[PDB]
């Protein structure tokens, strides 16, 4: 991606260097009083919220290049008590104290717009997920997740559309009611788990039950959306 690469080298030229994180590490955490701007360049991360009960809530999954800010750009206070856990085996992210981000994005506004557009895509993505859910429930929720993963990491094989993402990661992404829906998916042969990898064989089904998230990926990632459309 062009905007992401230009933003990376903008950060690097201003003295901000990348940082490596192995799986299960938190790039930021809900107890740190200092907020940051994570520019997740490479790897797969997970936004979590740990309540006092020790219970972990998976709120969102990000994949570089993306931007995740734990604090408000103006007040610098927490936008929510969240952690960013690396779920891939290793990830590369740029960590920028919320205050320095203002200085850096105020001089060069071209990448200011990049951060802006990432936030906008988050908004539209959440609204599309809410719509798909509110009509087709979790069947559509899981269909939309599988659909976007097929778009990004899917490439064709004699068996279907192989999800090239490593099995370990895909396990980290949850792959009673969820597994029941997934077993029905396997019943109608929409997806097939074979030879250590996932395969999508009926793309139109996932598209049918995730229309709004499909529209979202079309309006937000048209170049990659058209890979299998």
The residues binding a copy of itself (CB under 8 A) are: 3, 47, 49, 51-52, 57, 59-60, 69, 72-75, 77-82, 102, 105-106, 109, 112-117, 119-124, 126-128, 130-131, 134-135, 211-212, 215-216, 219-220
List the single partner that 130 binds among Na ion, a copy of itself, none, CB under 5 to 8 Å by kind. Answer: a copy of itself
Least distance to a copy of itself, CB of residue 119, Å = 4
- What is the C-alpha separation between 68 and 86, in angstroms, rounded? 13
List the single partner that 204 binds among Na ion, a copy of itself, none, CB under 5 to 8 Å by kind. Answer: none
Of 124 and 164, which has the nearer Cβ to a copy of itself? 124
Of 32 and 188, which has the nearer Cβ to Na ion? 32
- What is the C-alpha separation between 190 and 179, in angstroms, rounded? 14
- What is the C-alpha separation between 36 and 84, in angstroms, rounded? 11
Burial of 75 (0-12, 13-18, 19+ CB in 10 A): exposed
Least distance to Na ion, CB of residue 81, Å = 7
Using alpha carbons, select from 90, 87, 93 the residue that is nearest to residue 65.
93
The string of DSSP codes covering 81-109 is: S-EEEE-SSEEEEEEEEHHHHHHHHHH-H
Least distance to Na ion, CB of residue 52, Å = 17
Cβ atoms of 178 and 167 within 8 Å: the answer is no
List the single partner that 32 binds among a copy of itself, Na ion, none, CB under 5 to 8 Å by kind. Answer: Na ion
Residues engaged in binding Na ion (CB under 5 A): 28, 32, 70
List the single partner that 122 binds among a copy of itself, Na ion, none, CB under 5 to 8 Å by kind. Answer: a copy of itself
Cβ atoms of 68 and 38 within 8 Å: the answer is yes
Least distance to a copy of itself, CB of residue 197, Å = 29
Which two tokens mark 104? Answer: 């850096």
Of 97 and 207, which has the nearer Cβ to Na ion? 97
């Amino acid at each position: 991606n062009a905007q992401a690469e230009e933003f990376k080298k903008y950060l690097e030229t201003n003295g901000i260097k990348p940082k490596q994180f192995h799986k299960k590490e938190l790039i930021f955490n809900q107890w740190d009083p200092q907020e940051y701007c994570i520019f997740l360049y490479d790897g797969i991360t997970k936004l979590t919220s740990i309540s006092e009960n020790g219970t972990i809530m998976n709120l969102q999954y990000y994949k570089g290049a993306f931007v995740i800010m734990s604090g408000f750009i103006d007040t610098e206070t927490s936008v929510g008590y969240y952690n960013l856990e690396v779920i891939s085996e290793q990830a590369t992210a740029y960590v920028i104290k919320i205050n320095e981000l203002k200085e850096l994005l105020s001089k060069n506004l071209t990448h200011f717009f990049y951060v802006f557009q990432t936030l906008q895509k988050q908004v539209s993505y959440s609204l599309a997920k809410f719509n798909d859910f509110s009509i087709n429930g979790k069947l559509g929720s899981i269909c939309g997740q599988l659909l976007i993963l097929t778009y990004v990491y899917g490439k064709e094989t004699p068996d279907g559309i192989k999800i090239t993402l490593d099995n370990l990661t895909m396990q980290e992404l949850g792959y009673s009611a969820v597994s029941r829906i997934i077993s029905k998916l396997k019943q109608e042969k929409v997806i097939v788990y074979k030879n250590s990898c996932f395969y999508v064989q009926n793309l139109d089904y996932l598209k049918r039950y995730a229309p709004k998230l499909d529209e979202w990926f079309y309006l937000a990632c048209p170049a990659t959306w058209g890979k299998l459309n």
